[PDB]
Amino acid sequence: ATHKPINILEAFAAAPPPLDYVLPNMVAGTVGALVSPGGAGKSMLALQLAAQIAGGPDLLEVGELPTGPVIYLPAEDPPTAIHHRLHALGAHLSAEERQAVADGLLIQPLIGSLPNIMAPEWFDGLKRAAEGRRLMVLDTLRRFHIEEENASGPMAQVIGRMEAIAADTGCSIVFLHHAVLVDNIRWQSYLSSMTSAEAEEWGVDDDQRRFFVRFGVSKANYGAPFADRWFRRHDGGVLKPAVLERQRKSKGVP
Template identity: 30%
Template sequence: MTDFHFDKVPSIDEIDSVDLMNLSYEGRKPMDFILPGFLAGTVGSVIGAGGGSKSLLSQIISFNVGGVKSVDLDIGDIPVGRSVFISCEDPKIVTEDRALAIKEYCTQEEWEMVARNVDIKCFSEYSIDIMDDRWFKLFVEMLEGTRLAIIDTLSLIHSYDENVNTDMKKIISRFRQICEITGSGILFIHHANKGTVLSGNADSQQAARGASSITDNVRFQLNVFMPSNDDRDFKKVAGTLKNRDCVALLASKVNYGEKYGTFYYERISSDHPNNKGGYILKKLQKGASSEQKKYD
């Protein structure tokens, strides 16, 4: 655990400095990435339009960190660890349906690992204010010992004005404080600007709704959007699929590590009669079958 001095101005002797004389690769651990390009202990975001599958995609990320490989976004190496998905927007049954749709494709061994590693907390009945010390302490407690926390959504855990840069800077700083104390990384989900989406720029780094500091102060950003029918790369992998049945994922901001391109996924609904809202995402690849193996 690291002390984070949120309101303190340090003395010159208290500032952590780089010892250039003794700096060496020997005995020094390399950077640890939760996802490709997303450094452990930092703050990132998932940006997308309403109803655009950003919550499902984020829940799959949480499960991938927890050990699921059968339903995999296939964006690169994702080391296994504990994760917590903090659902503030959707009713519990919606989150459960998404989890059950993923479970249909998992082995028993995988699901037992998920049950150990993934924690889903449902707060749709609460009004959260992360700037309130009581909520702050609860979040620190939830994130202790986790590798990744996903917050769904940003707008539901504070009472500040999301169009004011200074306000949003304070919220992101609050997240950084939690990361420093717990060692966990935080990905928060946030809505895209409607004008950006309608103009066909949902893949832009500036797609987030509200103040620019929402983007400027995170170290990593994923954009989730419906691919365009004019997208040549999408056409190469889509076959007969319509763009409305698919989801595109792009890391539009990667401060650490190598950048990577756009990935495309098909939305596959659960065929269980008691699951009306759950579905998974299957990566589209040229010449690959759309069939996905299920486990009984």
């Protein structure tokens, strides 16, 4: 990506247009990450945010977000599993909403395709796939490079190429990560399953905490504070705002 010098006098003289956020606290045209241990629900959450930006409803009740074409690249899930996940989500959408989602969302399975962003063929293809789009989701980062995720140099190159695509096309990029990488990212969100401790704190008996997960923004530079959110895992894993009440007075001794 190449940029023209900033017009300093203009920036001083007039108020610049408000920042454009693709996601809460994430500026459009940049790279971000969604992290959590495997199985926490990143793929489901990612699909839901993708569907919302594509034009679907705000089922997650995060802020209302601008709409634009979205491309989701799942490289770890078998296609038939994705079918089932979409069918499950579909139960939460009206006929008009299902249509809007299909009109703005592209899902291209890449399991076994071996994408390597450090290879010209894939960098070129990914950049072309980002053109005209507002968001690109990579699930997960591990399958889009062949470097050591512990090597700062190689990873600075891998992440740098995502920044190049985003800056040149305007299409934001969010990669999922099972868990440095975070040091090279300016926006980071996460998923954290409800712990036994949190279960007691929110009046959820153990045995049931398996159905709740919290989401928040762990790293951001701009925008108003985004409060952590609790989601309930419905049939098929679909996430929806949880209805929970703080257990001010303990039920026993935590």
